[PDB]
DNA sequence: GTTTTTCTTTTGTTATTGTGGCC
RNA sequence: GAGGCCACAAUAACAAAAGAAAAA
C-alpha cells in the first residue's frame, strides 16, 4: 500500500539543472538504470514532466547511483519531520564502539504514492548533447529521499523489535540509509553481534569501525613556550589572545602590550615583568579550561567550517552561533579535493551521531572545482548542504594551536 | 499512429481569449485556400461556438498567449554539440523531415484551446473557425512533443544497426557510419522506409545534399570542420555598436583560431553610450585589432575526436589579463582553440588566473568529450607548488607538465617568514576622515626616522596602503614593516601582479625591487608601542 | 550601544547588445 | 499583433546574498 504525500502550498516541484558527467560514469549509470527498470522500480518518462533533480555515479567497488534529493528534501521537510520524525537518542554518542552498514536495498519494494512520482524526475545526460537525455522516474522509495525513512519507519521498528527486547543496552538509530549501532562490547564480542543483525536482515531481504564517539574530545588551545620573546612574537602573540576574546572572554593582553613601550626593533628581547608572565599563564588556563556558556539548540542549523591548516592537514569547527563552537578538531591525511571530501563525510558521521543532523559546510574551495572532481572520492549515500567561502587568516592562524593526540 | 504525449495548461490558466482583428480581402482570400487545405489534409478542424477560445492569425498563427498558458517542459536539445566533439565517418547524410510537426497529433484534449478564426470581409457577420489537430508551428510544445516521437521512432532501427550514428536535431536527422559509400547508402534508403512507416518524409537519393554540410554556423566534412570566414569590416571611423558588431564575430572565431583577443576592445565598450555614439578606438585597441586581422587571413580547421587517443591542452598566457589555449590530439592537429577573459576580483595573481584557466577548460572538455584533459602549462612545476601549499583555498589539477614557451608565469615575489634582522624596523598607519576624505600616513623607525603625508580625497584603506608604500620607497633593500589594517596586509599577501587600482600595482613594483620583505600585523587602539606613535602623527589632522 | 558604510579573496540574478543559428 | 527561441559572449543593473573590515 502507499501513503499519500503532498508537498507544501507554496512550493513547486524541484528544477535543479543536471552537472556535466564523465563518459565512464555515464555508461556506468545508463546500465544501472536499465536493470532498475527491467525490476520495476523506475520507469521512462516523457516531455511533459517538467521537473528534474541531480543523478550521480559514486564509488561505494562496484560502480553505485547517487540522487543528489537536495532540494526535494526541503520541499517535503514538514512531512519526514513534523508527521513523521523520528526522535534522536542522546544515548548514541556514549557507547564505546558504533558501526553503520548500508540498509539501502529496504527501501527498493515499497511502492511510492503515485500522484507523487512526477517529482522524483532525473536525467541521465549525454555527452556533447548528441542525444536528448535519458529521464527516468521513481515507483518506489528512493534511497536518499528523506521521506523514505519516515514511511518505512513504522516498518522499521517491526523489524527491529526482536532485536531489541532481546539485547536492550544497544542503541539502534537510522539516518537516510544507515542504521547506526551502539555498544559497549570487546571488539570481537562487537563483531559478532554485528554478523547478528546480517543474518537477521537478510530475512526482511536486505543485504548489508568507528569506535571513535568516546575518542571525539575537543583538545586545548596550546599557546608558544619561549625561553627568550622578541617583540615580534609578544606582537604577533598579542593579535591571536586579542581575536580568540571573542571566543573565550577571559583572556587579556594589557600586561602583554604593555612591555611594548616605544618603538622597539622587531628582534629585541623582552623579557616578561611578573605580571605580564601572569597574565600569560592565567591565559594558558583559560585555553586549557573545557569552554563553557555554550548548549546545543535543536531549533537552529548546525554550520560546519573547514580550513585548510597545512600541507596534508585540515582543522574545523561544528557550530551554530559564531564563536560557539560545539565541537572543534584536527583531520590529517592524496590531495587537497581528496582530503577535504573525506574531512566532510567524517565531520557528517560525527555529527549524525552526536545530534541526528548534518551541518551546512562552509567549504574553502572554488566551487566549479568542488562541482568536479567531490564524486571522484564521495563515499556516502547523503549529500550536506554546503557553501563556498574564504578563510580569515586569523581562523587559520588560531585553530592551528589544539593539541593534536598520539 | 503516434501515440499523443499529454499536455496541460500552467495551474490556474484558461487559454487565450484575444480578439482577432480584420484582415485584406486579399490576405482573407488566401487564407481560406490555405486553411481549406489544411482541413481536407485533417491538420485542422472547423469548429463552432462550443469554443470560446481564440488566437489571431499571423508560422500561421501568432500562439504568443498561448504560450504563456502552456505548461513548462524539460530542457529540449539544451546546448549544441560542438563538431568537435563529433567522430570522424567516412559517410554522412542528412535527412531534412519535411512534414514533420504535421506529422505528429495533438492531445485530444489541448485541441481546444489552439482555436483560430479568418474573419468575412464585411465584418458585420462572423468568420470561419477552426482549431488544431497536429502540433501546431511555433506552439511551445511542438518542438520537444516532436522530438519525443522521433527518438521513439528512431529506436528500433539504433536497436538494429548498432554503428550506424543518428543525431537528430530539429527537424533534421544527420546519420555518419564507416560503411562504404554503397553500403552506406543502402542504410540510408532503409532508414528512409523505416521512418515513412510513421508517416515522416525525407528527400530520395538524388535530392539529399551532398557533403560539406551547413549546420549552427559551421561546416561539417566527414573528417574536418571549420567556420564560415570572417570579415572584420575596415571602417575609419566606429560606433559602439560597431564595437559590439566585432567583439561578437571575434568571439565567434576564438574556437578554431588561436590566440584571439578582445579585452582592449572591450574596454572601449565600458563607457554606457548610446549605440549611435561615435568611440574613438585605443591604441592598445587599435594594435590588437590588427592582431586579430592577421589571425583571420590565415585558413583554419579543426579535426575530430579520437576516443582512443589522449587528450592534450595547452595554454599561453597572450597578454594583458587574457590568456589562450589549443586542444589537440597530435602535435599540429588542434580539435579546437579559446580564450579566457577572467578578471573576477580586483586583485589576482597570475599563478591562480591560470589555474582559472585551467578550471573552465577541465569543465568544457567534460562537456564535449566527456573526459579531461592532459596540460601543458607555462608554469614551472615548483612555481606552481609553493604558491598552493602557501594558500588558503584549495584546488586540483589532476595532470599537467611544464612547458617552456613564454612568457612564463612565476611569483615576481615573496615575503619573508620571519624578521629581517639589521633592517630597519618601521611602523606604519594611515587614517582618514569619515566625511571630507581628508587623510594621512606616514611611518617612524627603530632608528629615529619618521614621515608623514597629506592625501586628499581619499579613505582610511587607500591611505593604510600608501603608509606601506611610504615605507618601501624610502627604506633599503631589506626592510621590516608593520601596519594595522588586515584589509592592506591581505591584498599584499596575495601577490597580485595586475590590479584595478594603480596605487596597488605600483607597490609589486617595490617589492621586486627590495630583496627583503616582513610585513606583519598589530591591533589597532591597543597601545602597542611603534604603532602607538604613528598612530598619533597619522590621525592628528582630523581623527 | 548596535546600526551605518567600505572592500572583497564566496555565490547568484534580470535586462541590453553582439556573433552563430533555428522556426 | 511594440517576433519568439537556443548557445556563447560583452555591457549595464540588484546584489537586500554571503563574508570580512573599518569607522562612528
Ligand atoms: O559523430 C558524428 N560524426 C560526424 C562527422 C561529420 C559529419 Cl558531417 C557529421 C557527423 C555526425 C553529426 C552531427 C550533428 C552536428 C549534426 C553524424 F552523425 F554523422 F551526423 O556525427
Ligand atoms: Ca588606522
Ligand atoms: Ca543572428
Not at chain 2, 554503428?163 to 546519420?175: E, F, R, S
Request: hydrophobic share 35%.
Amino acid at each position: 500500500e502507499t501513503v499519500p504525500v503532498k508537498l507544501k502550498p507554496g512550493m513547486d516541484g524541484p528544477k535543479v539543472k543536471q552537472w556535466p558527467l564523465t563518459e565512464e560514469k555515464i555508461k556506468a549509470l545508463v546500465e544501472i538504470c536499465t536493470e532498475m527498470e527491467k525490476e520495476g522500480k523506475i520507469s521512462k518518462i516523457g516531455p511533459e514532466n517538467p521537473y528534474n533533480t541531480p543523478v550521480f555515479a559514486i564509488k561505494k567497488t562496484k560502480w553505485r547511483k547517487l540522487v543528489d534529493f537536495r532540494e526535494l528534501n526541503k520541499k517535503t521537510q514538514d512531512f519526514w519531520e513534523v508527521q513523521l520524525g523520528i526522535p534522536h537518542p542522546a544515548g548514541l554518542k556514549k557507547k564505546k564502539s558504533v558501526t553503520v552498514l548500508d540498509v539501502g536495498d529496504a527501501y527498493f519494494s515499497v511502492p511510492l504514492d503515485e500522484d507523487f512520482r512526477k517529482y522524483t524526475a532525473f536525467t541521465i545526460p549525454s555527452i556533447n548533447n548528441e542525444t536528448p537525455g535519458i529521464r527516468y522516474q521513481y515507483n518506489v522509495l528512493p534511497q536518499g529521499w528523506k521521506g523514505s525513512p519516515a514511511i518505512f519507519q513504522s516498518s522499521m521498528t517491526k523489524i527491529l523489535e526482536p532485536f531489541r527486547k532481546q539485547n536492550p543496552d544497544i542503541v539502534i538509530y537510522q539516518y537516510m540509509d544507515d542504521l547506526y549501532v551502539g555498544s559497549d562490547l570487546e571488539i570481537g564480542q562487537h563483531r559478532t553481534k554485528i554478523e547478528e543483525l546480517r543474518q537477521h536482515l537478510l530475512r526482511w531481504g536486505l543485504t548489508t569501525y568507528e569506535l571513535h564517539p568516546d575518542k571525539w574530545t575537543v583538545q586545548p588551545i596550546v599557546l608558544p613556550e619561549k625561553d627568550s620573546w622578541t617583540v615580534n612574537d609578544i606582537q604577533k602573540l598579542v593579535g591571536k589572545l586579542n581575536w580568540a576574546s571573542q571566543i573565550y572572554p577571559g583572556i587579556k593582553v594589557r600586561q602583554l602590550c604593555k612591555l611594548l613601550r616605544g618603538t622597539k626593533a622587531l628582534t629585541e628581547v623582552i623579557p616578561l615583568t611578573e605580571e605580564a608572565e601572569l597574565e600569560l599563564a592565567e591565559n594558558r588556563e583559560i585555553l586549557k579550561e573545557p569552554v563553557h556558556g555554550v548548549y546545543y539548540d535543536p531549533s537552529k542549523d548546525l554550520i560546519a567550517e573547514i580550513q585548510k591548516q597545512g600541507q596534508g592537514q585540515w582543522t574545523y569547527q561544528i557550530y551554530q552561533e559564531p564563536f560557539k563552537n560545539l565541537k572543534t578538531g584536527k583531520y590529517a591525511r592524496t590531495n587537497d579535493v581528496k582530503q577535504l571530501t573525506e574531512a566532510v563525510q567524517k565531520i557528517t558521521t560525527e555529527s549524525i551521531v552526536i545530534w541526528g543532523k548534518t551541518p551546512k559546510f562552509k567549504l574553502p574551495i572554488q566551487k566549479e572545482t568542488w562541482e568536479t572532481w567531490w564524486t571522484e572520492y564521495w563515499q556516502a549515500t547523503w549529500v550536506p548542504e554546503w557553501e563556498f567561502v574564504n578563510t580569515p587568516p586569523l581562523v587559520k592562524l588560531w585553530y592551528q594551536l589544539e593539541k593534536e593526540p598520539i | 499512429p503516434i501515440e499523443t504525449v499529454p499536455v496541460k495548461l500552467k495551474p490556474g490558466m484558461d487559454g487565450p481569449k484575444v480578439k482577432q482583428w480584420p484582415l485584406t480581402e486579399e490576405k482573407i482570400k488566401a487564407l481560406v485556400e490555405i486553411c481549406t487545405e489544411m482541413e481536407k489534409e485533417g491538420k485542422i478542424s472547423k469548429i463552432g461556438p462550443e469554443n470560446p477560445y481564440n488566437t489571431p492569425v499571423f508560422k500561421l498563427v501568432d500562439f504568443r498567449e498561448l504560450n504563456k498558458k502552456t505548461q513548462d517542459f524539460w530542457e529540449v536539445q539544451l546546448g549544441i554539440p560542438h563538431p568537435a566533439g563529433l567522430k570522424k565517418k567516412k559517410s554522412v547524410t542528412v535527412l531534412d523531415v519535411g512534414d514533420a510537426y504535421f506529422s505528429v497529433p495533438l492531445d485530444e484534449d489541448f485541441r481546444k484551446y489552439t482555436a483560430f478564426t479568418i474573419p468575412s470581409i464585411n465584418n458585420e457577420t462572423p468568420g470561419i473557425r477552426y482549431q488544431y489537430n497536429v502540433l501546431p508551428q511555433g506552439w511551445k510544445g511542438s518542438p520537444a512533443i516532436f522530438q519525443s516521437s522521433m527518438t521513439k521512432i528512431l529506436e528500433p532501427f539504433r536497436k538494429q544497426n548498432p554503428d550506424i550514428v543518428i543525431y537528430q536535431y530539429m527537424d533534421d536527422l544527420y546519420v555518419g557510419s564507416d560503411l562504404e559509400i554503397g553500403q552506406h547508402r543502402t542504410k540510408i534508403e532503409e532508414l528512409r522506409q523505416h521512418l515513412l512507416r510513421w508517416g515522416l518524409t525525407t528527400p530520395d537519393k538524388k535530392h539529399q545534399k551532398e557533403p560539406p554540410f551547413l549546420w549552427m554556423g559551421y561546416e561539417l566534412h566527414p573528417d574536418k570542420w571549420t567556420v564560415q570566414p570572417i570579415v572584420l569590416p575596415e571602417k575609419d571611423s566606429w560606433t559602439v555598436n560597431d564595437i559590439q558588431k566585432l567583439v561578437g564575430k571575434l568571439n565567434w572565431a576564438s574556437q578554431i583560431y588561436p590566440g584571439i583577443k578582445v579585452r582592449q576592445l572591450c574596454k572601449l565598450l565600458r563607457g554606457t553610450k548610446a549605440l549611435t555614439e561615435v568611440i574613438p578606438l585605443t591604441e592598445e585597441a587599435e594594435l590588437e585589432l590588427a592582431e586579430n586581422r592577421e589571425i583571420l587571413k590565415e585558413p583554419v580547421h579543426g579535426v575530430y575526436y579520437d576516443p582512443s587517443k589522449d587528450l592534450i591542452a595547452e595554454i599561453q598566457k597572450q597578454g594583458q589579463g587574457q590568456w589562450t589555449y589549443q586542444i589537440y590530439q597530435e602535435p599540429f592537429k588542434n580539435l579546437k582553440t579559446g580564450k579566457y577573459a577572467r578578471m573576477r576580483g580586483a586583485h589576482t595573481n597570475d599563478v591562480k588566473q591560470l589555474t582559472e584557466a585551467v578550471q573552465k577548460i577541465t569543465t568544457e572538455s567534460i562537456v564535449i568529450w566527456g573526459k579531461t584533459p592532459k596540460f601543458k602549462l607555462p608554469i614551472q612545476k615548483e612555481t606552481w607548488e609553493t604558491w598552493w601549499t602557501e594558500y588558503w583555498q584549495a584546488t586540483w589539477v589532476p595532470e599537467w607538465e611544464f612547458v617552456n614557451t613564454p612568457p612564463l608565469v612565476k611569483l615576481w615575489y615573496q615575503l619573508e617568514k620571519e624578521p629581517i634582522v639589521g633592517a630597519e624596523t618601521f611602523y606604519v598607519d594611515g587614517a582618514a576622515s569619515r566625511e571630507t576624505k581628508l587623510g594621512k600616513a606616514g611611518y617612524v623607525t627603530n632608528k629615529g626616522r619618521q614621515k608623514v603625508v597629506t592625501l586628499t580625497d581619499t579613505t582610511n584603506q587607500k591611505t593604510e596602503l600608501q603608509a606601506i608604500h611610504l615605507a618601501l620607497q624610502d627604506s633599503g633593500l631589506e626592510v621590516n614593516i608593520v601596519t594595522d589594517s588586515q584589509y592592506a596586509l591581505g591584498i599584499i599577501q596575495a601577490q597580485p601582479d595586475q590590479s584595478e587600482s594603480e596605487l596597488v600595482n605600483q607597490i609589486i613594483e617595490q617589492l621586486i625591487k627590495k630583496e627583503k620583505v616582513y610585513l606583519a600585523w598589530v591591533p589597532a587602539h591597543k597601545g602597542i608601542g611603534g604603532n602607538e606613535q604613528v598612530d598619533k602623527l597619522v590621525s592628528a589632522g582630523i581623527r
